[PDB]
């Protein structure tokens, strides 16, 4: 089962203040209207792939979801990350740790740190060794699917760890609904209000109207015809041709010569 | 460390005095890319990394951006856009040993070339021939790492060199490493020549209403001129208005 990414998965791309401006940037963002996968830890929490940045969200009441694991094989061979809220405070550790494939909560080393009613929305990416975590916490009136609407996520964590992440797992307490989507290298026009809060965005490759909006640097397009891009037929295969010569030439012979 | 498995140490949250290395006159090379030596003390960096390893003297020339060779391609590759300094010196009286120092290793065999700044410490037997090696040395099956065997009697090209590659993150993000500078006090509504963590210009500092989110350090204009800063010592935001000018 899947849900519709109704403008969710957008965050502040840098640490530079901007306001009252439409600014064009490039980053790993959840594509607008992408297919986000449903998961329920009821009656499983499969280990999921981390492609090139991942989008997460969860619906909550009693903090049933309390953490996550990011890594590769998770059997003490490379560096991997464990983040747990612990129903106390946050502890983060990265090492060559051996994991259970069924870790749970009840109801060699590189880094260590010690610190429905609503929805937690957050994203992760890892750039040049920096694990970057962005999030927001808002109320919901929806009890299964994800809420619609736009508000950008803020950075919370930015850590130079060098963690190898190809896979991950959600950590829940047991005696349970969450979502996973993926980020893409897309161009966006971001709308910053007078306080520098991103209140809207255009996914520049969603469709031809959004393409026009990015071209014109506007969220409003006037009646008319705009030239926004070029159509190009792509090659489908390559062709390589050289004469079918089986002869080799005496290159070795000018280096291994008896006399010069 | 051996070059095949070079070490990395992170430098952060400090005052970095680079004159101690630069003016020591104790290095065979101190080549900087993107920055000039001695200007480092006026700069701020986000993180600073120091990679370290031992190579032989003829190979010092391989530790460079855009460069190729057995180390540049199988042990330690620098990117074409590298910003940093390659500092190295002779260790013939430290690392070389009588009978040969065989502790230092380099990779001679690899299936493909390395990406900038990665490591490969696999001991998988290299499949030079057509018959699968299955983990065992033999004809056309090789252990991938070789020792240097450094001796005090070797000529310079084969003497060991200690190399430190210092990488500089000159990013917009807040600095954690700054040179040995002293601060002065702030003024408001006056025209000053300012320097905020390496960000310079001339302008008039005023109290700002541009609340910056907790992670934001400065504001920016259409032309990339900055227009607001978070002061490095006090958490207030200043606006930067260019000093008045006009035609005469």
């Amino acid at each position, epitope marked *: 089962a899947y849900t519709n990414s109704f403008t969710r998965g957008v965050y502040y791309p840098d640490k530079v203040f901007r306001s009252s401006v439409l600014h064009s940037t490039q980053d790993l963002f959840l594509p607008f209207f992408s297919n986000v996968t449903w998961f329920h830890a009821i009656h499983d929490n499969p280990v999921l792939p981390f492609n090139d940045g991942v989008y997460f969200a969860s619906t909550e009441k009693s903090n049933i979801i309390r953490g996550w694991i990011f890594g590769t094989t998770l059997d003490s061979k490379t560096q991997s990350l464990l983040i747990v809220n612990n129903a106390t405070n946050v502890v983060i550790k990265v090492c060559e740790f051996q994991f259970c494939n069924d870790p749970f909560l009840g109801v060699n080393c590189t880094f260590e740190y010690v610190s429905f009613k609503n929805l937690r929305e957050f994203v992760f990416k890892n750039i040049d060794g920096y694990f970057k975590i962005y999030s927001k916490h808002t109320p919901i009136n929806l009890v299964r699917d994800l809420p619609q609407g736009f508000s950008a996520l803020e950075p919370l964590v930015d850590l130079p760890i060098g963690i190898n992440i190809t896979r991950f797992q959600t950590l829940l307490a047991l005696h349970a609904a969450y979502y996973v989507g993926y980020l893409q290298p897309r161009t966006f026009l971001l709308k910053y209000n007078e306080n520098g809060t991103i209140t809207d965005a255009v996914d520049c490759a969603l469709d031809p109207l959004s393409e026009t909006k990015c071209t014109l640097k506007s969220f409003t397009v006037e009646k008319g015809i705009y030239q926004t891009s070029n159509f190009r037929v792509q090659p489908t295969e390559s062709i390589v041709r050289f004469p079918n010569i089986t002869n080799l030439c005496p290159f070795g012979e000018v*280096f*291994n010569a008896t006399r010069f | 460390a051996s070059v095949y498995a070079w070490n990395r140490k992170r430098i952060s949250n400090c005052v970095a005095d680079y004159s101690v290395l630069y003016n020591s006159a104790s290095f065979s090379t101190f080549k900087c890319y993107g920055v000039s030596p001695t200007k480092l003390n006026d700069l701020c960096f986000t993180n600073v990394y120091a990679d370290s390893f031992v190579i032989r003297g003829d190979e010092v020339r391989q530790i460079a951006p855009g460069q190729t060779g057995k180390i540049a391609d199988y042990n330690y590759k620098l990117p074409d856009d590298f910003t940093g300094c390659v500092i190295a010196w002779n260790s013939n009286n430290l690392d070389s040993k009588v009978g*040969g120092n*065989y502790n230092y290793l380099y990779r001679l065999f690899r299936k493909s070339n390395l990406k900038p700044f990665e490591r490969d410490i696999s001991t998988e037997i290299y499949q030079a021939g057509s018959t699968p090696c299955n983990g065992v*040395e033999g*004809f056309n099956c090789y*252990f991938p790492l*070789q020792s240097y*065997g450094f001796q005090p009697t*070797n000529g310079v090209g084969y003497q060991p060199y200690r190399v430190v590659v210092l990488s500089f993150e000159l990013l917009h993000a807040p600095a954690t490493v700054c040179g040995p500078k002293k601060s002065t006090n702030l003024v408001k509504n006056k025209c000053v020549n300012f320097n905020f963590n390496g960000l310079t210009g001339t302008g008039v500092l005023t109290e700002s209403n541009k609340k910056f989110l907790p992670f934001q350090q400065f504001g920016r204009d259409i032309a990339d001129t900055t227009d607001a800063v978070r002061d490095p010592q006090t958490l207030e935001i200043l606006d930067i208005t260019p000093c008045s000018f006009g035609g005469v």
Partner: nanobody
Framework: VQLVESGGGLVQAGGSLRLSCAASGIIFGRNAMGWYRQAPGKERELVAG????????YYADSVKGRFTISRDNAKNTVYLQMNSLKPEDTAVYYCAADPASPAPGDYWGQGTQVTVSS
């Protein structure tokens, strides 16, 4: 950079002959080392080799039953023992790393001549 060989000489087929060589750490520290040979009428081939770690040995099949390869990591030397030499084994024997380049710049020592008579 420096390779030397010795232990050659003229013998009658049968008996035994032990070759020896040495190398500077630059070559001695390589993953594996062994002996190569050349003779009028035939190109250079690897006869036998021994690794640096584990003392793993291997031999060309054609010499497997009469040649023994060994090394000494304290002495920085390599040896090749021939038991019951044949006329076909007349060759100049050389010390070198098991992998080697065909380039003229890949250093070889002078080699030592082994001659075997009828």
């Amino acid at each position: 950079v420096q390779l030397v060989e010795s232990g050659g000489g003229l013998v009658q087929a049968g008996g035994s002959l032990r070759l020896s060589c040495a190398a500077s750490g630059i070559i001695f520290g390589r993953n594996a080392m062994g002996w190569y040979r050349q003779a009028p009428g035939k190109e250079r081939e690897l006869v036998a080799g021994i690794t640096r770690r584990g003392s793993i040995t291997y031999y060309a099949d054609s010499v497997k039953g009469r040649f023994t390869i060994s090394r000494d990591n304290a002495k920085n030397t390599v040896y090749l023992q021939m038991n019951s030499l044949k006329p076909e084994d007349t060759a100049v024997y050389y010390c070198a790393a098991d992998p080697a380049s065909p380039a003229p710049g890949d250093y070889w020592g002078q080699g030592t001549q082994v001659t075997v008579s009828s």
